[PDB]
Amino acid sequence: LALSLTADQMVSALLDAEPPILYSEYDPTRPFSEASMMGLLTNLADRELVHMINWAKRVPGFVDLTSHDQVHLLECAWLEILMIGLVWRSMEHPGKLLFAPNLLLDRNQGKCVEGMVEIFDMLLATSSRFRMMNLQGEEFVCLKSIILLNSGVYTFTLKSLEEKDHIHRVLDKITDTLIHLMAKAGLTLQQQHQRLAQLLLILSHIRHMSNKGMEHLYSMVVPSYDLLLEMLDA
Amino acid sequence: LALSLTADQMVSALLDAEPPILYSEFSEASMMGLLTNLADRELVHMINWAKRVPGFVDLTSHDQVHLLECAWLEILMIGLVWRSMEHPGKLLFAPNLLLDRNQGKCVEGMVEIFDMLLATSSRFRMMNLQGEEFVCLKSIILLNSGLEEKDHIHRVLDKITDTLIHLMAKAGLTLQQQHQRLAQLLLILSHIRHMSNKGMEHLYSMKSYDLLLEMLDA
Numbered sequence: 001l002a003l004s005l006t007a008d009q010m011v012s013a014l015l016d017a018e019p020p021i022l023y024s025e026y027d028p029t030r031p032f033s034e035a036s037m038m039g040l041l042t043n044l045a046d047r048e049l050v051h052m053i054n055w056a057k058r059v060p061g062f063v064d065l066t067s068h069d070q071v072h073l074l075e076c077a078w079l080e081i082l083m084i085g086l087v088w089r090s091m092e093h094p095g096k097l098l099f100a101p102n103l104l105l106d107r108n109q110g111k112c113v114e115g116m117v118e119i120f121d122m123l124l125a126t127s128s129r130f131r132m133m134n135l136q137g138e139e140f141v142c143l144k145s146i147i148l149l150n151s152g153v154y155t156f157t158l159k160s161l162e163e164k165d166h167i168h169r170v171l172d173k174i175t176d177t178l179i180h181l182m183a184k185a186g187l188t189l190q191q192q193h194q195r196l197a198q199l200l201l202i203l204s205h206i207r208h209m210s211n212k213g214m215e216h217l218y219s220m221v222v223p224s225y226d227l228l229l230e231m232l233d234a
Numbered sequence: 235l236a237l238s239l240t241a242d243q244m245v246s247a248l249l250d251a252e253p254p255i256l257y258s259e260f261s262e263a264s265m266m267g268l269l270t271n272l273a274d275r276e277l278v279h280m281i282n283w284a285k286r287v288p289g290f291v292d293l294t295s296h297d298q299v300h301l302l303e304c305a306w307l308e309i310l311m312i313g314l315v316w317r318s319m320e321h322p323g324k325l326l327f328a329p330n331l332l333l334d335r336n337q338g339k340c341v342e343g344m345v346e347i348f349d350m351l352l353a354t355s356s357r358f359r360m361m362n363l364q365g366e367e368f369v370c371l372k373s374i375i376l377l378n379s380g381l382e383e384k385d386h387i388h389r390v391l392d393k394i395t396d397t398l399i400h401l402m403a404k405a406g407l408t409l410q411q412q413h414q415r416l417a418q419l420l421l422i423l424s425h426i427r428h429m430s431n432k433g434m435e436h437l438y439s440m441k442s443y444d445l446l447l448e449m450l451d452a
C-alpha cells in the first residue's frame with residue numbers, strides 16, 4: 001500500500017521506522033590503538049546493521065520486493081546508510097563525529113587508524129553541509145530511504161522489470177513527499193526545486209564516501225550477501 | 235556573467251560548448267591501447283569544453299584543476315552512455331568502435347563496469363533523455379563532484395537546476411512531473427559516481443593534477 005500513502009503518511013511511517021541511537025562498548029582502554037579503535041567501531045557498526053535490516057523492512061515499498069532484491073539493495077547501500085546516519089547525528093557537534101553518545105571523535109583521533117583521516121574529513125564536510133542547509137529530520141528520513149532504494153536499482157525478464165518500475169514509483173513518491181515538506185515549510189516553487197536538487201547532489205558525495213570507505217575497509221568484517229539474506233529472513 | 239543568463243541562454247551556451255565525437259585509430263592490451271588512445275584525445279576536448287561552461291572560468295586555476303581531477307572519468311562515462319542510447323546492448327566508444335557486452339570480457343574485470351554502463355544507457359533510453367538535459371547533467375557533474383568560490387559554485391548549480399525545470403515546463407510537463415523527473419536525473423548521477431570510482435579502481439589495477447594543470451593553462 002506504499003503507492004496509496006499521502007506525503008504526511010509517508011513521513012509518519014519513516015519516522016516510526018527510525019532505528020535507535022546505540023552506545024559503544026563501555027569504558028575501553030583510552031587512549032586508542034589502531035586495532036582497539038577499529039574493534040569498537042566494528043562492534044558498533046555490526047549492532048547498527050541488525051537495526052538497519054528491521055528499519056528497511058518498514059520502508060514502504062521495500063517489503064513488496066523479492067528477498068533476493070531486498071538483499072541486493074541492502075548490500076549496495078549499507079555503508080551509505082551507516083554514513084548518512086553518522087553525519088546526521090554529528091550535525092550539532094562541528095569538527096566532531098558522534099559515532100555514539102559515548103564515542104564523540106574529533107579529526108585528530110581519526111589519525112589513530114591510518115587512511116581513516118581522509119574519510120573522517122569527508123564525513124565532517126558533509127555534516128557541515130547539512131548544518132548549513134538546516135536539514136530537517138523529516139527530510140533526513142526521506143534521503144535515507146532514497147539511498148536504500150536508489151543505490152542498487154541500476155545493477156539489477158518480466159519479474160525484474162516489474163520490480164524496477166515499482167522501485168522507481170516509490171522513489172517518485174518520496175520525491176513528492178520531499179516537495180510537500182518544503183511547500184508546507186513555506187518555500188517558494190523555485191526554492192523547492194533548488195533545495196531538492198541540493199539534497200540529491202549531496203547523495204553523490206555520500207556514494208563517493210561509501211566507495212572510499214569500502215576500499216579503506218578492504219585494505220585492513222564486511223557483511224556478505226549470505227549474512228544479509230540470513231538476517232532478512234528473521 | 236553566468237548568474238545573469240536565462241534558461242535558454244544557459245542551454246545555448248552548453249550546446250555550443252559540446253565537444254565533437256571522435257573516432258578510434260583483440261587482445262587485452264590492444265583493446266586497452268585503443269580505448270586509452272581515444273580517452274586521452276577526448277580529454278583534450280573536455281578541458282576546452284570545461285572552460286566554456288558558464289561559471290567555471292570565474293574560478294581560480296587551482297580550483298578548475300581540482301574539479302576536473304575529480305570529474306574527468308564521470309564526464310567521459312556520461313558522454314559514452316549518451317552516445318550509446320540508440321544501440322541497446324552495445325557501447326559506442328566511437329562510430330568505428332561499437333562494442334557489445336561479450337567483447338568487454340576480453341579485458342579482465344571490465345565486464346562488470348561494461349554492465350553498469352549499459353544499465354545507465356538503458357535507463358536514459360527509458361527516460362527519453364534529451365540533449366538539452368544531457369548537457370546540463372554534464373555541467374552538474376563538473377561543478378558538483380569536487381568560501382566565496384564555494385558559494386559561487388552553489389549559485390551556478392542553482393541556475394542549472396532552474397534551467398532543467400524550464401526545459402521540462404517548456405516541454406509541457408506538470409509541476410509534479412517536473413520535480414519527479416529532476417530527482418530521477420539527479421539520482422542517476424550517484425550511479426555515475428559509483429561507476430567512476432569502480433572505473434578508477436579497475437584502471438589502477440592495470441596502470442595527474444600536474445598534467446591537468448598543464449593542459450588548462452593552454
Ligand SMILES: Oc1ccc2c(c1)O[C@@H](c1ccc(OCCN3CC(CF)C3)cc1)C1=C2CCOc2cc(O)ccc21
Binds near residue numbers: 274276344434436
Ligand atoms: O572515449 C572513451 C570513453 C569511455 C572510455 C574510454 C574512452 O576508454 C576507457 C579508458 C581508458 C583509459 C582511461 O584512463 C587512462 C589514464 N588517463 C590518462 C591519464 C594518465 F596519464 C589518466 C580511462 C578510460 C574507458 C572508457 C569507459 C569509462 O571508463 C573506463 C573504465 C574502465 O574500467 C575501463 C575502461 C574505461
Ligand SMILES: CC1=C(c2cccc(O)c2)[C@H](c2ccc(I)cc2)Oc2ccc(O)cc21
Binds near residue numbers: 041048083213217
Ligand atoms: C562510517 C563508519 C565507519 C568507517 C568506515 C570506514 C572509514 C571510516 O572513516 C569510518 C566505521 C566502521 C567500521 C567497521 C565497519 I564493518 C563499518 C563501519 O565505524 C562506524 C560505526 C558506526 C557507524 O554508524 C558508522 C561507522
Ligand code: NI
Binds near residue numbers: 179189192409410413
Ligand atoms: Ni512543484
